[PDB]
Scaffold this active site. Structure first.
Site, short mmCIF file in Angstrom:
data_model
loop_
_atom_site.label_atom_id
_atom_site.label_comp_id
_atom_site.label_asym_id
_atom_site.label_seq_id
_atom_site.Cartn_x
_atom_site.Cartn_y
_atom_site.Cartn_z
N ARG A 160 2.41 -13.48 0.47
CA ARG A 160 2.63 -12.11 0.87
C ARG A 160 2.25 -11.23 -0.31
O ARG A 160 2.72 -11.43 -1.43
CB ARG A 160 4.11 -11.92 1.29
CG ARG A 160 4.59 -10.48 1.45
CD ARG A 160 4.05 -9.79 2.68
NE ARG A 160 4.48 -10.44 3.92
CZ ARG A 160 4.04 -10.11 5.13
NH1 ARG A 160 3.17 -9.09 5.30
NH2 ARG A 160 4.48 -10.77 6.19
N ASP A 204 10.49 -12.09 8.25
CA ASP A 204 9.36 -12.45 9.08
C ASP A 204 8.60 -13.65 8.46
O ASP A 204 8.19 -14.55 9.17
CB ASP A 204 8.44 -11.24 9.24
CG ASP A 204 7.22 -11.55 10.01
OD1 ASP A 204 7.30 -11.57 11.25
OD2 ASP A 204 6.17 -11.80 9.36
N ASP A 250 8.28 -11.12 20.12
CA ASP A 250 7.27 -11.88 19.36
C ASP A 250 7.61 -13.38 19.34
O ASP A 250 6.80 -14.24 19.67
CB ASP A 250 7.16 -11.28 17.95
CG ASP A 250 6.19 -12.03 17.06
OD1 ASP A 250 6.63 -13.06 16.49
OD2 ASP A 250 5.03 -11.61 16.92
N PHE A 280 12.68 -5.72 3.96
CA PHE A 280 13.69 -6.46 4.73
C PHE A 280 12.99 -7.22 5.85
O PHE A 280 13.16 -8.44 6.02
CB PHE A 280 14.77 -5.47 5.21
CG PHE A 280 15.57 -5.89 6.40
CD1 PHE A 280 16.33 -7.04 6.41
CD2 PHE A 280 15.64 -5.05 7.51
CE1 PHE A 280 17.10 -7.38 7.51
CE2 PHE A 280 16.43 -5.36 8.62
CZ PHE A 280 17.16 -6.52 8.62
N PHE A 302 -2.72 -0.33 14.68
CA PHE A 302 -2.42 -0.95 13.40
C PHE A 302 -2.06 -2.44 13.56
O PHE A 302 -2.44 -3.26 12.72
CB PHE A 302 -1.28 -0.22 12.69
CG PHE A 302 -1.12 -0.60 11.24
CD1 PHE A 302 -2.04 -0.20 10.29
CD2 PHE A 302 -0.05 -1.36 10.83
CE1 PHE A 302 -1.90 -0.55 8.97
CE2 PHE A 302 0.08 -1.71 9.50
CZ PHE A 302 -0.84 -1.31 8.57
N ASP A 355 7.92 -17.04 10.46
CA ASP A 355 6.51 -17.30 10.78
C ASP A 355 5.95 -18.42 9.90
O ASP A 355 4.80 -18.80 10.06
CB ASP A 355 5.67 -16.03 10.59
CG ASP A 355 5.97 -14.96 11.62
OD1 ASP A 355 6.68 -15.29 12.58
OD2 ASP A 355 5.48 -13.81 11.46
N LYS A 410 7.86 -4.09 17.83
CA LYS A 410 7.95 -4.79 16.55
C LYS A 410 7.31 -4.00 15.43
O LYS A 410 7.68 -4.17 14.27
CB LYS A 410 7.41 -6.24 16.60
CG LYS A 410 5.90 -6.41 16.53
CD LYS A 410 5.51 -7.86 16.22
CE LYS A 410 3.99 -8.02 16.16
NZ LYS A 410 3.55 -9.33 15.70
N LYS A 432 0.81 -1.21 0.00
CA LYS A 432 0.00 0.00 0.00
C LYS A 432 0.85 1.28 0.00
O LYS A 432 0.36 2.37 -0.32
CB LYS A 432 -0.93 -0.01 1.22
CG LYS A 432 -1.95 -1.13 1.18
CD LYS A 432 -2.82 -1.14 2.43
CE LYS A 432 -2.04 -1.45 3.69
NZ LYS A 432 -1.53 -2.85 3.71
N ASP A 436 -4.04 -5.82 12.32
CA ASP A 436 -3.35 -6.89 11.63
C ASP A 436 -3.65 -8.25 12.23
O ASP A 436 -3.88 -9.22 11.51
CB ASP A 436 -1.83 -6.64 11.63
CG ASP A 436 -1.08 -7.71 10.85
OD1 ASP A 436 -1.24 -7.75 9.62
OD2 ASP A 436 -0.35 -8.51 11.46
N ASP A 437 -3.67 -8.32 13.56
CA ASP A 437 -3.97 -9.56 14.25
C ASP A 437 -5.40 -10.04 14.00
O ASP A 437 -5.65 -11.22 13.76
CB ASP A 437 -3.74 -9.41 15.75
CG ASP A 437 -2.29 -9.24 16.12
OD1 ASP A 437 -1.40 -9.30 15.24
OD2 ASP A 437 -2.04 -9.07 17.33
#
Ligand SMILES: O=P(O)(O)C(O)(Cc1cccnc1)P(=O)(O)O
Ligand SMILES: O=P(O)(O)C(O)(Cc1cccnc1)P(=O)(O)O
Ligand SMILES: C=C(C)CCOP(=O)(O)OP(=O)(O)O
Ligand SMILES: C=C(C)CCOP(=O)(O)OP(=O)(O)O
Ligand SMILES: [Mg+2]
Ligand SMILES: [Mg+2]
Ligand SMILES: [Mg+2]
Ligand SMILES: [Mg+2]
Ligand SMILES: [Mg+2]
Ligand SMILES: [Mg+2]
Lengths: 343, 343
Positions: free
Chosen positions: A105, A96, A167, A91, A232, A100, A193, A50, A236-237
Site C-alpha cells: 500500500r 481493507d 463488496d 482506517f 474514480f 483483501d 463503498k 495523494k 481503481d479497478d
C-alpha cells in the site's frame, strides 16, 4: 494548480496533528506505550497518499468562505478537518488490506504484513477512527457546525461499511458465480463503498464549515460528486490489473479475490460462451498463470480501449452535471476536483 | 432482584432495535443484501450475554429520574441507550476474539470462526459500532443530552482501544519476557480496556439522561466504578483458566496468548527461581501439556485461594467507596450493580 498551492501548508500541519494526539500522554504516563504505538500507526498509515480528500476540504473551504473569515484559527480548523478525512481513509485502507489479502500500500508493505503487527492491525485501524473524533472535539467543539461534522463522519462511515459488506458478499472466496457480476450490482457497491466518503464527504464538510447546511445545496452537490465517485472506483479497478505497481504503489488482487470489478462486469457483457468458460475456469484463483489467462482475455476484448472511452464519456457527463447542479456554489470547486482525478 | 424485574422488558426491545435498523432498506433496495447481513451479525453477536451493561443503564435511569418523567417515550430511549452499550460490547468482543485467537463466545463458535465469515468479521464489527450512532440519532437527537451521549460513547471507545493496545503490546506472540508482567502494568491495562466501558459508561449514560452532567458527580461515580471494573477483569482472568467453559461460554486462551493476566502477575510475586523457570519454559505456548504445567503451578501457589481473598477484600473496599462517594446519587445504584457482579 490550486491543490498544489494549498498542499505544502496542509502536509506540514500533520506535525501538529501528531503532537496534539500524543499529548494525551502528558496527563497519563501509564498509557505511554500505547501512545507511542498510536504515533507509529499514524506515521505509517496516514502519510504517503495523494491527499485528494483532505486537500479538497481545504480548497473548497477557501473557495466557499469569505476571505474576511479565513483567519489563522479558521484555517487551522480547515486543515484539521482535512486530516480527519485522511484518517478516515487510513482506517478504511488498513482494514481493507487485511480483508483483501493485499501486499503493499502506497509503495510499502501493508501494515498488517509488517512483522510483529499482524491481526493487531484490527485495533490499530479502530484507533485511527477514534482519532477523527478526538481532533473534531479539540479543534471544533465550540463552532456552530460541530455536531453537523460529527454526524457527517459517522454517517459516511456507516455508508462505507455497508458498501464494504456488499463488496465482500459479492466476492465470496472459492465460490465463482459470475452471474452475480452485473452492472446494477457494481454501481451499488461503488456508490456505497467509495463515492460517499471519497467525494461527497470532503466537499460536504467544507459546506458545513461555510454555513451551507441546506438540504437542497447538499442534494445538488451529491448529484455531481457520487458520479465522480463511480468513475474514480472504475479507474481503481482498471488500475488493479493494468496499472504499474511502481506508480500505483499497490499490487493488484481483484482477480485472485474473486471481486466484482468493473473489468469482469465488462468482460461478461462482451464474452462468447467460450470466453465465458475461460473466465469461469481461471477467475478467483491465486495461481499466477490463471490470473495471466484472465488478463489476456481482457486484452482480447479490448477492455483497455473500452475504459478509455468510458473515461471520456464520463468526463463529459460530469461536466454537464456541473453546468446544471453547481449553483449557487462556484463551479471552480467541482472543476478543480474533476481535473485532479481525470488528468 | 431489580435487574431481574427490568430484564424481560429490555430483552424484548431488541426486536424493535433490529426492525428500525433494517428499515434503512425500505428506501434503498440496492443495499438489501447488506442489510440482511447486518441482521445476521446483530442476532449472532448482540444476543446471549448477561446484559449487565445494558440493564445497568435502565436500572440507573429508573433510580435517577423522577417517576413523573418515566413516560413510554423516555423508557423507550432508556432501553435503546442500554442496547447501544450492548452493541459497543459486541463490537469489542468480535474483534477481540479475532485478535486473541479464541474459539467460542457465549456458548457458540466465535463469529470469525464460522465457515464463510473469517476476516470479513472485521467489517461486521465496525458495522456494530456504526449502529450505535444510528440508534442514538433516531431516538435521541432532539433530547438535550444527545451530544453528551455521543461524546461519551466516542470517548469510551477511544479509552477501550488504548487499553486493547496495551493488552496486545504487553503480550507479544512468541516473546516471553515475564519481567513486563507487573501489577502496575496490569492495573493500567484493565482500567483502560475494561473499566471505562463496562462500568463508568453505562452509569454515566443514565446520569446524562437524568440531567446530571456535573464534573463532580461524574468524578465521584468514576472513583467507585473503575474500582469495580478492576475486580471484574480480575475475575475474568481467573475464570479463563479455572472457569468451566460450559458456564463461562468461552474457552480460555490467556496462557497460550502470552497475556498479562492477573494470575501470571500473582504467580511472579510468589515464585521461587525454580518455579519462575517452569513458567518461563511453558508460558505463551499452544501445547496442551505446557498449558497444563502452568495451571499446576498456579494450583501449587494456591492462586485460587488468593483470588477468593482478593474478592472479599475488594467487596469491602468498594462498599467503603460507596459510603464515601455515592452522594448525592442513591447508593442503591451502586449496590445493585455490585451485587450483580460479586454474587
Ligand atoms: O486501494 P484498493 O485496495 O484498490 C480499494 O480501492 C480500497 C477501498 C477501500 C474501501 C472503500 N473503497 C476502496 P478496493 O475497493 O479494495 O479495490
Ligand atoms: O471475554 P474475554 O475474551 O475473556 C475479554 O475479557 C474480552 C475483552 C475485550 C475488550 C475489553 N475487555 C475485555 P479479554 O480482555 O480478551 O480477556
Ligand atoms: C477509494 C479508493 C479507490 C482507495 C484509493 O484511494 P486513493 O487512490 O485516493 O488512495 P491514496 O491517495 O489515499 O493513497
Ligand atoms: C469486559 C469483559 C470481562 C468481557 C466479558 O464481559 P461479560 O462477562 O459481561 O460478557 P457478556 O455477558 O456480554 O457475554
Ligand atoms: Mg483493497
Ligand atoms: Mg476492498
Ligand atoms: Mg482496488
Ligand atoms: Mg479475549
Ligand atoms: Mg483480549
Ligand atoms: Mg478474558
Amino acid at each position: 494548480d490550486v491543490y498544489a498551492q494549498e498542499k505544502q501548508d496542509f502536509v506540514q500541519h500533520f506535525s501538529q496533528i501528531v503532537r496534539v494526539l500524543t499529548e494525551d500522554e502528558m496527563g497519563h504516563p501509564e498509557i505511554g506505550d500505547a501512545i507511542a504505538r498510536l504515533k507509529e500507526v499514524l506515521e505509517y498509515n496516514a502519510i504517503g497518499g495523494k491527499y485528494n480528500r483532505g486537500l479538497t476540504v481545504v480548497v473548497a473551504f477557501r473557495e466557499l468562505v469569505e476571505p474576511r473569515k479565513q483567519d489563522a484559527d479558521s484555517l487551522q480548523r480547515a486543515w484539521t478537518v482535512g486530516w480527519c478525512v485522511e484518517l478516515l481513509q487510513a482506517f478504511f485502507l488498513v482494514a481493507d488490506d487485511i480483508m483483501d489479502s493485499s501486499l503493499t500500500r502506497r509503495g510499502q508493505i501493508c501494515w498488517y504484513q509488517k512483522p510483529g503487527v499482524g491481526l493487531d492491525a484490527i485495533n490499530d485501524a479502530n484507533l485511527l477512527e477514534a482519532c477523527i473524533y478526538r481532533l473534531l472535539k479539540l479543534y471544533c467543539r465550540e463552532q456552530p457546525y460541530y455536531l453537523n461534522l460529527i454526524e457527517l463522519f459517522l454517517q459516511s462511515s456507516y455508508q462505507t461499511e455497508i458498501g464494504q459488506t456488499l463488496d465482500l458478499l459479492t466476492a465470496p472466496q472459492g465460490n465463482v458465480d459470475l452471474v452475480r457480476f452485473t452492472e446494477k450490482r457494481y454501481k451499488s457497491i461503488v456508490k456505497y463503498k467509495t463515492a460517499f466518503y471519497s467525494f461527497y464527504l470532503p466537499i460536504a464538510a467544507a459546506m458545513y464549515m461555510a454555513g451551507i447546511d441546506g438540504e437542497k445545496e447538499h442534494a445538488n452537490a451529491k448529484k455531481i460528486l457520487l458520479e465522480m465517485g463511480e468513475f474514480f472506483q472504475i479507474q481503481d479497478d482498471y488500475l488493479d490489473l493494468f496499472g504499474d505497481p511502481s506508480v500505483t504503489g499497490k499490487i493488484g488482487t481483484d482477480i485472485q479475490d474473486n471481486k466484482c470489478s468493473w473489468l469482469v462486469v465488462q468482460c461478461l457483457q462482451r464474452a462468447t460462451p467460450e470466453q465465458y468458460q475461460i473466465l469461469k475456469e481461471n477467475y478467483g484463483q491465486k495461481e499466477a498463470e490463471k490470473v495471466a489467462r484472465v488478463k489476456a482475455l481482457y486484452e482480447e476484448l479490448d477492455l483497455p480501449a473500452v475504459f478509455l472511452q468510458y473515461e471520456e464519456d464520463s468526463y463529459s457527463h460530469i461536466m454537464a452535471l456541473i453546468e446544471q447542479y453547481a449553483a449557487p456554489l462556484p463551479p471552480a470547486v467541482f472543476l478543480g476536483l474533476a481535473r485532479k482525478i481525470y488528468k
